[PDB]
Amino acid sequence: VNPCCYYPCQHQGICVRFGLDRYQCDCTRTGYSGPNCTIPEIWTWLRTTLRPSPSFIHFLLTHGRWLWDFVNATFIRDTLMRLVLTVRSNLIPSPPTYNIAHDYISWESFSNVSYYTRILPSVPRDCPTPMGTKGKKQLPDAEFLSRRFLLRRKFIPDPQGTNLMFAFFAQHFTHQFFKTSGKMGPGFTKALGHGVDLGHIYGDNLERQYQLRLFKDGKLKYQMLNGEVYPPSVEEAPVLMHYPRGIPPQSQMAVGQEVFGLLPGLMLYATIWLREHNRVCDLLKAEHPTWGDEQLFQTARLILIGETIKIVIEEYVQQLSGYFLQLKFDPELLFGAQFQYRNRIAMEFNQLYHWHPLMPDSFRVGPQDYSYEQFLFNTSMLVDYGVEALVDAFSRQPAGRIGGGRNIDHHILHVAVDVIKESRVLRLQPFNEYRKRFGMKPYTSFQELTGEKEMAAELEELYGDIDALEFYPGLLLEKCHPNSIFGESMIEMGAPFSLKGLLGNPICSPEYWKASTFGGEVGFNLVKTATLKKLVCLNTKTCPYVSFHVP
């Protein structure tokens, strides 16, 4: 039998088949040696024995308010942020490694970017079981597993007080780089650029961008309604949008991300950013009167990418982490370090980001409470209430807890189901194996996994062996910290993926991080000082309560 099915190689060592039945682990640069890369090197042993547990670190980061307040105001802040930035990233490989077609390095894997990459090779198609060596011959019925462990029974709010403003941001944001090609199958992505390219505002292809663009003052096309500014209609911006048959082009808003029409929350953020883009153009023009359309546009896009990356690090991630340490966005922190300014979206990263539990039972907008069947495709609510109106409403309603289990609304539970199904087609490796990839002890029992005995008990009869527990279910059912939005694994695995994909951008490089790049000091500060509040209020008549945290 395929020896690599036993996943013999520890610590990032590579399992290669040799002869008819042998195998060898390439322990190059893994820090360990031996047949399976288990014998540590002197420095490696020290490092691994002198590293406080993930939970301990988390502890230190979420306590000592008085302490941090003092640290955050010194240089230690920067020092730690850099540590975080670097340490966390070195986990994600770059240049990227494998994809759904190759479980080994290949020039194509590195060239063909329609491919999502993956951190761990697939479970060899010829292993005794679906997960490799352990578990039953057939995995739990996807749907059952979902109804039994992910379906929300009673709404469980996120203890960290995260709101829908955050939720919808997360959705809007991720959908600029998570765009699975329906025409190519799983593992493929129409979101080339694999990162924060703001393709969800400008489009994933030129023609579409060109269509979305006004080609005057560098501005982006738009339309006026009730005296306010909203994205143009599909009749004026003949772009392709995914709306249900029966809705005329004059009722569809063209934005950059085809799917964004299927939720006011999305189209909301779409409007906000469009608004901003246009505004930045104005700013740039006052400064550079000799500039043409292209450059005004091109520059304005770089500024928004900067802003986006800023707001995500200092307010969005901050929100999630709940850290007392003040996260900081400063491309310079890495100028001394060894870092590759490029990113390649991983399928595992895609899985992990399905945060559907955030969605509420219903959507409250003031005295009015809207249902899914009232929200999901409402092509007027946005224009009816207005940007400010919604931002105030979404900032006040709490999002649901992500980790914990049984907290996904039925209206959208069908997704978590496909996520599991897709996982198997992608032949993702076992949860534990991924745990190790991200420097964590594998779980020994389902009862160590979940914080309890009853659910674990059932998961055990179903999966057979904790070592068969799949990637997504593991992330979503794993026990949660004291009162955090999710578990250890979610943080330990996701943080690397998110920090790398944030700093691994060309504008974060020393070659790009110049003021000239953003049209001078004016444009540069726009980035250096961007904030969720400003992003909203500097583009709306009134200023509502805006924040990722419910008041």
Ligand code: HEM
């Ligand atoms: C009312 C709210 C929401 C609805 C109706 C919804 C619906 C969907 C649907 C239908 C898919 C496609 C999968 C399929 O064809 O079965 C999807 C994918 C996804 N959703 Fe949600 N979603 C919602 C909220 C969210 C939120 C809050 C997040 C968190 C950031 C999120 C993240 C994702 C991700 C990452 C994907 C994968 C996209 C891809 O692979 O291209 N969704 N969602």
Ligand SMILES: *[C@@H]1O[C@H](CO)[C@@H](O[C@@H]2O[C@H](CO)[C@@H](O)[C@H](O)[C@H]2NC(C)=O)[C@H](O)[C@H]1NC(C)=O
């Ligand atoms: C990236 O890889 C995919 C799959 O390896 C390529 O698509 C396949 O192309 C071959 C020959 O053109 C066809 O026989 C298949 O039908 C295609 N399959 C899919 C999934 O579309 C794709 O051409 C590659 N992209 C580039 C530009 O290199």
Ligand SMILES: *[C@@H]1O[C@H](CO)[C@@H](O)[C@H](O)[C@H]1NC(C)=O
């Ligand atoms: C290497 O791993 C294989 C499979 O798990 C095992 O049979 C073998 O005993 C291991 N060798 C060492 C020295 O750990």
Ligand SMILES: *[C@@H]1O[C@H](CO)[C@@H](O)[C@H](O)[C@H]1NC(C)=O
């Ligand atoms: C859309 O929302 C408005 C209020 O924003 C409501 O009056 C109307 O009934 C909704 N239409 C739908 C989708 O049922």
Ligand SMILES: CC(=O)ONC(=O)c1ccccc1O
């Ligand atoms: C210190 C650090 O990396 O924080 N990151 C996160 O909390 C984080 C962000 C996005 C997704 C999952 C996460 O766990």
